[PDB]
Design a protein around this nucleic acid. Structure first.
Lengths: 362, 154, 363, 362, 156
RNA sequence: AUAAACCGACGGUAUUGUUCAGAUCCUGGCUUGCCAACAGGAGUUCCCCGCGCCAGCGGGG
């Protein structure tokens, strides 16, 4: 009852537009026959990667790109003093195929997350390959033996270990395929939303008479974010890392999911709101509490309170009907008395995080 | 035998900024029923004959995209909505898959959002007839025209 | 009424894409003149076979493949300490119909489910060729007599005993034909669905923020209705004359999986890990699907879930009274409802329902 | 009246209950519109091979024809063609008990195919007494035939209701047993939108991976099954035979039509649906109500309700115009009802079968 | 199963006391509190709830005054009687924006506004039409009201 | 009792893995809702009980 760690977050946002269409439309989704404002999971994940908190507590994020011409120069810059450029070019060419050099624009198949640690390690290997004249096929055969040693490098690129990586060309198709370890859902509102429309203008300071016109869709909303971390898979993706090491990353994910908000239209719609509820529970089976809002919550005193209430009630029903999955802990800023008793109430967030660090104990 | 004339379009062109502003500010055709300037606009054609009401709601709703969103171009047969949206080049075919799979009010909404984004040139009476019926074959034909034109201009 | 056990499941899913087309579109199907989002029965089956619950409670799943060149290596690894490589090669060669060359790549006719247990058994039986030499056709004729002895080894399969298999080549075409024993339907939504589209981008860290053409991913939420049916006698036969109680235990495992397991498609990015909101099980002399309860696509009052439960219960009442069926019928629901009628016993928890099944509907 | 008419409206979930030689759903154009079809042979096999059939017809009390009972009659119906000694010889070879030994239960009428076959046997033993091959010598060459008729003399009701078994040891023209129930092709009441399932086959040893592709056509729809029963023919082929017994069989036919479904792809699509409507009516002439759906039914709230409505509305105006007379009863799961009475409304199927069993009397 | 015009007639013939009790009411729900209402509306629809809401509306409109709503039968040439919209338009005292606000109102509020309009309009109309529209009072009926008013003013 | 009769096209199958829609923007300026007006005629106020009765007085609901 402790492989999966489930993260449920209820967070309310003031009038804003945190996720947009290709036509300046608010991202939405139909649930329970009602329209909900949606925030795509990609937006949340990238919002986490490029956050300062991630930079402070987890490390450097990966470099996702197709431009191998730029990446060539970057790798030549950061690995210039440790390796020969002849080796770097060959390495990058082996992982994707086939850069060589001097080309103004080299593009891979799709946007790939590259970490400099893996590339440096591969340089260390292909150096030996050049030393003992190992054929590239033989080198592949050797490297495929111990994939864990490759996965150890993902400690300097945890976002890949969490979000996964897909490879089509190069040797990365045999060595760089990463599964898991974090499953994150698209954030949807717990209630129905009819999106408001802002009618703005642009004043020409050199004319007092006729009107300009502009439309920007926006809305406030109580979003439910769900996340899930497969600890075993996370340890595997980090090269057999300890569980204690994975749980810390998990806590950081809880914090970011509880605090981080996408920066879309935040200069004009400053919707910098913290989460009003964060519940974390350990289970061996992934469970999402989205069906707590299938019957779209109706505002009594706002949407937040009945959202918390509905959430708690559904968690109680699932807990009773399917049996208690494992340890659970809740942190709220609301005036709502919890109904289920087998969930530890945490006054502050850092206490919840501490509770997670100790594998759901004290 | 009663047909809605192209005069409507002209009327829409010649209508004042106020009433047009009242009309453009609308989410659904029923809310178009809600506003009076619409009734004043659509009476001659006209609104008082229920056989025409749905068609008028669709047509006016589409025109409500803007005064110069739908650009009329005379023709053998004139450019169709599919051919127009395809020629614009701004529209992705998936959104038209959506358009063909949509139901009732939703489709019209989706259609309007397309027009504003497309700024298409077409023969207005064709679109008028297609909006008059808007059956399964109109949808299908729309997608066909779009796909074929895009495939023919790539 | 006690040969077929019918499993009905109403389960609501948050926005996701649990099963795709060849154009990466959501699988759909038209029911009652309305579009329903569909989940393939093959998808559900494989989702069950490769599930952790299956591994914990039922055992190891079958290995389906055409690559006999890899399969020979696998079988040599797992059976090398028990048999000689030549015997294993002759075994696999007899079963598949192809020849084990020690080559790099030799393929079979089609994807075949192989269970290592029955293969080991066939190694033991073909080790009788090391004795007084019987012709391979002779040995075949000997094995033809007792098929039950072969089906006993299928308790390390079960997914084959449940879903069956078909052979075209080799000796398996005459010894490995399994028919039953579980009939499962394609999961369709109880309501009409207009699928949404996620318009995504991919930020290039060395060029972006800049302009880009966008990608599309069709997704949707929805209340799905899963149906399964188990022929107990056929299962007992498929397991080599196993006891009824055993078949009922396996049946309960099937119930739990059908109630909890969700296909892992697009779950890293959409994560629709939702439990079933209703699970009803009823014993009958004849299979019975309640799909026609949603022939008229349910319309949302307070979501699609509650009217789905309601419609299900109403149609079940109508059919039950009309055709005079007498279960052996039990329903488990999370929601508070007004369901009926006795004796479709209400079970507060899922485990009580499974226990009710294990004791042949009398509990 | 002599004929019994059975009309069934049954809805099927997405499936493929009947394929052609190219793995596509069987169809039929009706009213200029394409309809999905379930062949009559598929339905009739689904019935004849079912367990209910095996219980109520496979093990009926009238399945065994005792030749010793037919001593006198066979002598007077074949006395024109054969001598008495030849007949007695044949019966003695077939039973095989010579003695007469009047059973004190000598029948009044005989089944036609019986006299048809035993006449052939009489011919054979005649030319066998002319050659002449002794009893043993000829019994050796007639082994398969004798066994062949011996198994048929224990399946009276099966042959009487469904016909001979496509491999019965029958030779004479009278041996061609038809009826007694006629099953029509089941067509959809509406125009069907066929779906195409696009499946793959995953290889567990190369999950990278090249996918095994495949397609399969499937469709849901409301089918109209029609069948009729000739009671006189059923009594003649069980001759016998009281009308009440024939009715008792007719009830079984009704039940089988209301319940039984072909097993094509039911392991993967599971269209185990029960009939949503079934009407039974006596008549001097069999009539299908297919023209009720000659104009393709269009869906208002599903296809089922407007199909029921179309059926009833057709029966109202058309019933009296044609020679339908009486009596009629209908069992359905949803209103409305036909405005015309003289069509008793049955709450359950068992009440309907009981209604049929009492010759349609209330 | 339909409410007759007799109600109107009854309202005409009822004494000043009960009319005073009914007239001074703010909301249709508050109309339930007084007994004279029950005595008036007893023959037509109680206790069959299907009419109750409608009755609440109808009487409420009638509660505007004894001779506020002037009834005029449909002319043989007219084919259809003068409608509430046409009436309010012909009165000339009503501004269209308040009918806009009338179409935008919800539940009790709209009735509150409607009564307030009638008193200011003193309209002439075919009472069964108004009764029929009040029985359902759906969105289409509202929009139809606005149609009649705006169209009447623009056409005449 | 019809090129009829008797009469399954059957079994086996994840469509999978990667992805911010982003950045810029006052709906501004001008408007009386004014003119006329007793709420007064009236003791009805629906059901019991006690005592009166050219009258009426009380007690309960």
């Amino acid at each position: 009852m402790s492989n999966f760690i489930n993260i449920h977050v209820l967070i309310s946002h003031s009038p804003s537009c945190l996720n947009r269409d290709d036509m300046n439309m608010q991202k939405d989704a139909i649930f329970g026959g009602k329209r909900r404002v949606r925030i795509s999971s990609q937006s949340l994940k990238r919002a986490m990667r490029k956050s300062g908190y991630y930079a402070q507590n987890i490390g450097e994020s990966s470099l996702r790109t197709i431009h191998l011409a730029q990446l060539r120069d970057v790798l030549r810059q950061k690995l210039g003093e440790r390796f020969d450029q002849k080796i770097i070019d060959k390495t990058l060419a082996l992982l994707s195929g086939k850069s060589v050099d001097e080309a103004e624009k080299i593009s891979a198949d799709a946007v790939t997350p590259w970490v400099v640690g893996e590339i440096a390690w591969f340089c260390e290997q292909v150096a030996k390959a050049e030393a003992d004249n190992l054929d590239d096929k033989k080198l592949l055969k050797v490297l495929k033996e111990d994939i864990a040693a490759i996965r150890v490098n993902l400690q300097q690129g945890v976002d890949i270990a969490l979000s996964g990586r897909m490879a089509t060309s190069g040797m990365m198709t045999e060595l760089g395929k990463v599964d898991g370890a974090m499953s994150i859902a698209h954030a949807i509102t717990t209630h129905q939303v009819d999106s408001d429309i802002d009618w703005f203008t642009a004043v020409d300071d050199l004319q007092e008479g006729s009107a300009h016109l502009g439309t920007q869709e926006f809305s406030s909303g109580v979003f439910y974010r769900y996340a899930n971390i497969n600890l075993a898979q996370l340890q595997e993706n980090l090269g057999g890392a300890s569980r204690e090491q994975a749980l810390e990353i998990a806590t950081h994910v809880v914090h970011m999911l509880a605090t981080e908000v996408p920066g879309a239209k935040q200069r004009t719609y400053a919707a910098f709101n913290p989460a009003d509820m964060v519940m974390v529970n350990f289970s061996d089976m992934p469970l999402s509490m989205a069906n707590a809002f299938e019957k779209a919550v109706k505002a009594k005193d706002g949407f937040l309170q009945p959202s918390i209430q509905a959430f708690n009630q559904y968690w109680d029903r699932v807990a009773n009907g399917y049996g208690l999955n494992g340890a659970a802990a809740q942190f709220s800023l609301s005036d709502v008395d919890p109904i289920t008793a087998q969930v530890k109430q945490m006054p502050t967030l850092e206490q919840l995080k501490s509770w997670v660090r100790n594998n759901g104990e004290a | 035998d009663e047909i809605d004339a192209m005069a409507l379009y002209r009327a829409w062109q010649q209508l004042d900024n106020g009433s047009c502003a009242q009309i453009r500010r609308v989410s659904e055709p029923d809310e178009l029923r809600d506003i009076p300037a619409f009734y004043r606009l659509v009476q001659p054609f006209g609104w008082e004959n229920p056989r025409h009401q749905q068609a008028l709601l669709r047509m006016v709703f589409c025109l409500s995209a803007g005064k110069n969103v739908i650009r009329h171009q005379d023709k053998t047969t004139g450019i169709s909505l599919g051919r127009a949206l395809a020629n614009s080049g701004r529209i992705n075919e998936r959104r038209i898959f959506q358009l063909i799979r949509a139901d009732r009010t939703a489709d019209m909404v989706q259609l309007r959002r397309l027009l504003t984004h497309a700024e298409p040139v077409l023969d207005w009476p064709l679109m008028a007839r297609m909006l008059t019926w808007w059956g399964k074959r109109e949808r299908q034909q729309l997608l066909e025209d779009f796909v074929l034109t895009t495939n023919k201009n790539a």
